[PDB]
PDB file of C-alpha atoms in Angstrom:
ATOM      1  CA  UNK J   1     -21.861  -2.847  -4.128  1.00 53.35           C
ATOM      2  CA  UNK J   2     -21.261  -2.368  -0.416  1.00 54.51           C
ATOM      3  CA  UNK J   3     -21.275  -4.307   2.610  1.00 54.29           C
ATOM      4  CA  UNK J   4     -19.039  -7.547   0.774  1.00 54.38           C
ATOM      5  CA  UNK J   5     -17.458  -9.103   3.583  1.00 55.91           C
ATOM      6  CA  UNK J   6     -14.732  -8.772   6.143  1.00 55.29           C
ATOM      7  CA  UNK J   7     -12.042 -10.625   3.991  1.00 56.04           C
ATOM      8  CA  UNK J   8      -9.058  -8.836   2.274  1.00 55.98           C
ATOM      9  CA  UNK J   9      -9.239  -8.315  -1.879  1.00 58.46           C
ATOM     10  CA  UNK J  10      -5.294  -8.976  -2.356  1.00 60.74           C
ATOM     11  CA  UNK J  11      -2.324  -9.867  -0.515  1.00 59.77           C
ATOM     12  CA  UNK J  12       1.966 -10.523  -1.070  1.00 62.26           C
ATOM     13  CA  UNK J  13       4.749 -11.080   0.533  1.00 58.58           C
ATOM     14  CA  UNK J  14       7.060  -8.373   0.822  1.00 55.33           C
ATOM     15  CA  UNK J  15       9.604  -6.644   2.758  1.00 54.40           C
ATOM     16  CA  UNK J  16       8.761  -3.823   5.090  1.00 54.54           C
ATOM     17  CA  UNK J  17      10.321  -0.113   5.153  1.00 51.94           C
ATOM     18  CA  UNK J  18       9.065   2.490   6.951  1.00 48.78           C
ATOM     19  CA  UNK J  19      10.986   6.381   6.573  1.00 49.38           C
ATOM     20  CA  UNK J  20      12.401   7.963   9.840  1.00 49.01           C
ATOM     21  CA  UNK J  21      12.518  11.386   9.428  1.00 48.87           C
ATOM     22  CA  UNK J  22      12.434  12.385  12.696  1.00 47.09           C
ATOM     23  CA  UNK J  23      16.004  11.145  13.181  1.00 48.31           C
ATOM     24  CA  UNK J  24      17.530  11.231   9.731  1.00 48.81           C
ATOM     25  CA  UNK J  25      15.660  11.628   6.484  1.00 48.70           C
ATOM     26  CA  UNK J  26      16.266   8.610   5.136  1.00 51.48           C
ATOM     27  CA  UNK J  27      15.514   4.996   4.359  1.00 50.91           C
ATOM     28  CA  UNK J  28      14.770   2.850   6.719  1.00 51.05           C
ATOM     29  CA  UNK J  29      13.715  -1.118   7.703  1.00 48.18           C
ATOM     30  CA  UNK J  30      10.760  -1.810  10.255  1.00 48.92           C
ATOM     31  CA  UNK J  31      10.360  -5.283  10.065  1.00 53.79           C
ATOM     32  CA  UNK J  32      13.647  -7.592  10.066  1.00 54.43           C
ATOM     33  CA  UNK J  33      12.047  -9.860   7.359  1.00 55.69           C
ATOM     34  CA  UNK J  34       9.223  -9.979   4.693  1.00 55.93           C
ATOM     35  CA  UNK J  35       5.734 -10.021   6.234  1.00 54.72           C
ATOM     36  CA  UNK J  36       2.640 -10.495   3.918  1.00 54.44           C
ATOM     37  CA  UNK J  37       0.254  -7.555   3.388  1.00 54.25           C
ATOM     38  CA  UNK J  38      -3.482  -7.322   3.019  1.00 54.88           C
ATOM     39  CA  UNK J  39      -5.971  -5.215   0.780  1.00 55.92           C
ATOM     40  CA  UNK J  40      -9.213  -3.889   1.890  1.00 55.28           C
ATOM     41  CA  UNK J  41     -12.377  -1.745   0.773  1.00 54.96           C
ATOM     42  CA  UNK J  42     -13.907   0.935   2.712  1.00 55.23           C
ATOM     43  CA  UNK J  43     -17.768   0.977   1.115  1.00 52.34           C
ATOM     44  CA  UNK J  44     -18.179   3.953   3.483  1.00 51.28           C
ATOM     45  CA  UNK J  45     -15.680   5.820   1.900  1.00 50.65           C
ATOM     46  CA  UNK J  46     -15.681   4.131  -1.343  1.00 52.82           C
ATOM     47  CA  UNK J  47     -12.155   3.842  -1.535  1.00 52.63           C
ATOM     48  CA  UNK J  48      -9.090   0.742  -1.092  1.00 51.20           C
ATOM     49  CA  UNK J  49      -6.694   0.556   1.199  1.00 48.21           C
ATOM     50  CA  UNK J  50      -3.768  -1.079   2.466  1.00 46.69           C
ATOM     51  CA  UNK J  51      -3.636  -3.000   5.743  1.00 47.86           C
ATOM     52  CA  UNK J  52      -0.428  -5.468   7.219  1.00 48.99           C
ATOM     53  CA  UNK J  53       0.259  -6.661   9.931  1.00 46.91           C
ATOM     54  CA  UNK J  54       3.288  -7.925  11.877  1.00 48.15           C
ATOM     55  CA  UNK J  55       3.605  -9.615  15.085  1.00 47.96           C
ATOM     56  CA  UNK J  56       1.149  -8.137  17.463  1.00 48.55           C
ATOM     57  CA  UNK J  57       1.237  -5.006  16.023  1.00 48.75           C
ATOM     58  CA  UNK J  58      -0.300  -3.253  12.832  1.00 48.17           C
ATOM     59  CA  UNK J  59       2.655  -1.009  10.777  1.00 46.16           C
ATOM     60  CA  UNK J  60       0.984  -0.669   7.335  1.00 45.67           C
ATOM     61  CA  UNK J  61      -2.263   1.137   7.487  1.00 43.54           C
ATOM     62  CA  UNK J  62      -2.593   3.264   4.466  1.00 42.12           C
ATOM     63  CA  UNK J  63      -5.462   4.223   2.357  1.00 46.99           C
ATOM     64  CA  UNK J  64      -5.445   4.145  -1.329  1.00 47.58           C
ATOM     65  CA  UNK J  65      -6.145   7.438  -2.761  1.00 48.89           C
ATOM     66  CA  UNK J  66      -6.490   8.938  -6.465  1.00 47.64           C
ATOM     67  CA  UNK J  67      -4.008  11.514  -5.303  1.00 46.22           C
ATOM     68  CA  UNK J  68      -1.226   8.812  -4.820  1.00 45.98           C
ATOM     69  CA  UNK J  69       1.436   7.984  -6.866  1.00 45.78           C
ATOM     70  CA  UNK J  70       3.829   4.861  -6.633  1.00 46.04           C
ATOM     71  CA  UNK J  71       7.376   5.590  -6.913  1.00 47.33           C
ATOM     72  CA  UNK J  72      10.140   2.775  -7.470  1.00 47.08           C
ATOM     73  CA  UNK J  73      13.613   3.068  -5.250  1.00 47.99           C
ATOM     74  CA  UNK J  74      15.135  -0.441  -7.387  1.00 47.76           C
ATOM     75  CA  UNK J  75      14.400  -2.652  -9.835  1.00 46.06           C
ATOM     76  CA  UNK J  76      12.530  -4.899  -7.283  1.00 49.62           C
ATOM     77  CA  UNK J  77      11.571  -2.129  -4.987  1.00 50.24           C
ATOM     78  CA  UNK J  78       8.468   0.016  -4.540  1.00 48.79           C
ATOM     79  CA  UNK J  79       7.016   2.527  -2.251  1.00 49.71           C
ATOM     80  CA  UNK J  80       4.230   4.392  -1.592  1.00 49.82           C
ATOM     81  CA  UNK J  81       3.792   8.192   0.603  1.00 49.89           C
ATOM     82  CA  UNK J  82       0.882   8.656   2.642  1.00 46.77           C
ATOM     83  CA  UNK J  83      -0.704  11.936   3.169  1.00 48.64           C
ATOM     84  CA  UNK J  84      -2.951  10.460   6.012  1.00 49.43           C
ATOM     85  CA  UNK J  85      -0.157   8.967   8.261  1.00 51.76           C
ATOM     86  CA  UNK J  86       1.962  11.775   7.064  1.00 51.58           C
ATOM     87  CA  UNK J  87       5.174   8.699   6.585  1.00 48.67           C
ATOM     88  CA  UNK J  88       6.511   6.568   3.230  1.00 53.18           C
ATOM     89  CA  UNK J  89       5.771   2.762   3.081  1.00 54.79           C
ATOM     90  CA  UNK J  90       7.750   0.713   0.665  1.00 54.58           C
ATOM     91  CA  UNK J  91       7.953  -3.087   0.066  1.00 52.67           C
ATOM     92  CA  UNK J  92      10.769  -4.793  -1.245  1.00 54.54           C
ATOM     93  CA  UNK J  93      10.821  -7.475  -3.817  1.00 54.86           C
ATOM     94  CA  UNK J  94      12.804 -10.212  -4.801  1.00 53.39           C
ATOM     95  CA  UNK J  95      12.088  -9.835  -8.454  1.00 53.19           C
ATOM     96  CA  UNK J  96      10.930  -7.130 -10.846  1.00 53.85           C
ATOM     97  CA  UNK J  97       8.668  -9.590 -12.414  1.00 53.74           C
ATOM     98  CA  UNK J  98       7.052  -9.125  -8.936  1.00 55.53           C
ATOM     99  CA  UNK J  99       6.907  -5.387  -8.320  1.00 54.42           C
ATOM    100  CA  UNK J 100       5.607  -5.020 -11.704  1.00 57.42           C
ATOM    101  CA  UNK J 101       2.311  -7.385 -10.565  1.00 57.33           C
ATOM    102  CA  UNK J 102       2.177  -5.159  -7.206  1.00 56.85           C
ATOM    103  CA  UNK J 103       2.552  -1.301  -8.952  1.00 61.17           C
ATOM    104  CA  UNK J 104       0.347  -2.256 -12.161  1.00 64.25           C
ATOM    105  CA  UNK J 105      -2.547  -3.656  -9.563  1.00 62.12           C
ATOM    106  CA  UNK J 106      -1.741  -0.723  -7.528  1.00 62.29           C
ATOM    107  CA  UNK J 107      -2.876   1.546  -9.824  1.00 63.13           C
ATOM    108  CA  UNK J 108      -5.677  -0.458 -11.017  1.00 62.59           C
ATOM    109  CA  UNK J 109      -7.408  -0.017  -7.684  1.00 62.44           C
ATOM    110  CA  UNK J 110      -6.986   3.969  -7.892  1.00 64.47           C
ATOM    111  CA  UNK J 111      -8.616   4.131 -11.111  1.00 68.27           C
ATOM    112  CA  UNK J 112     -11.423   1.888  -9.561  1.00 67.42           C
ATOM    113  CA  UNK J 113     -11.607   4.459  -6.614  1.00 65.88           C
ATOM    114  CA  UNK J 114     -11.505   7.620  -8.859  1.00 63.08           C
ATOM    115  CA  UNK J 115     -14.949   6.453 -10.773  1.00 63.49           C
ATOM    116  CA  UNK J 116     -16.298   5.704  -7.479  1.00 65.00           C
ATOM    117  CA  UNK J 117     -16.088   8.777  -6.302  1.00 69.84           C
ATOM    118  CA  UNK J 118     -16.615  10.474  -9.301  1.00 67.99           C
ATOM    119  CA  UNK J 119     -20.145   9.028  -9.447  1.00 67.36           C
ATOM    120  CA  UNK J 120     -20.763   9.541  -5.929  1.00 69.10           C
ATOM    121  CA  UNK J 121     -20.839  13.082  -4.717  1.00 69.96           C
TER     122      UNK J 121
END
């Protein structure tokens, strides 16, 4: 299984945070409303990942490791650290009903990586 395509394996339509802890450690917005973000799969690396995209500019760009973990901040709110970007990404939600669909798939995809590499080197 390699070389699929060019098109994303899952996408929704969240809000975007981004941590600033180079000011204040804290919570904090980067895009002033929801924005929709995109999955992809790296056959080179065997691995997900998690691309989005707002305006002319790329903020998300995080790779979905077995090492991760997902960590909820509200009952319709989810984020995610990144050891690669060395930051915290978190989308907001306006339901549970739908960070429950993003966090279970989440962690379907780093099971999916975890066998992949497991088997490969």
């Amino acid at each position: 299984g390699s070389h699929m395509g060019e098109q994303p394996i899952f996408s929704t339509r969240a809000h975007v945070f981004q941590i600033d802890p180079n000011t204040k450690k804290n919570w904090v917005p980067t895009s002033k409303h929801a924005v929709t973000v995109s999955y992809f799969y790296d056959s080179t690396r065997n691995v997900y990942r998690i691309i989005s995209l707002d305006g002319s500019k790329a903020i998300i760009n995080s790779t979905i490791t077995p090492n991760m973990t997902f960590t909820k901040t509200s009952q319709k709110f989810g984020q995610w650290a990144d050891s690669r970007a060395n930051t915290v990404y978190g989308l907001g939600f306006s339901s549970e009903h739908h960070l429950s669909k993003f966090a279970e798939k989440f962690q379907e995809f780093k099971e999916a990586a975890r066998l992949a590499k497991e088997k490969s080197q």
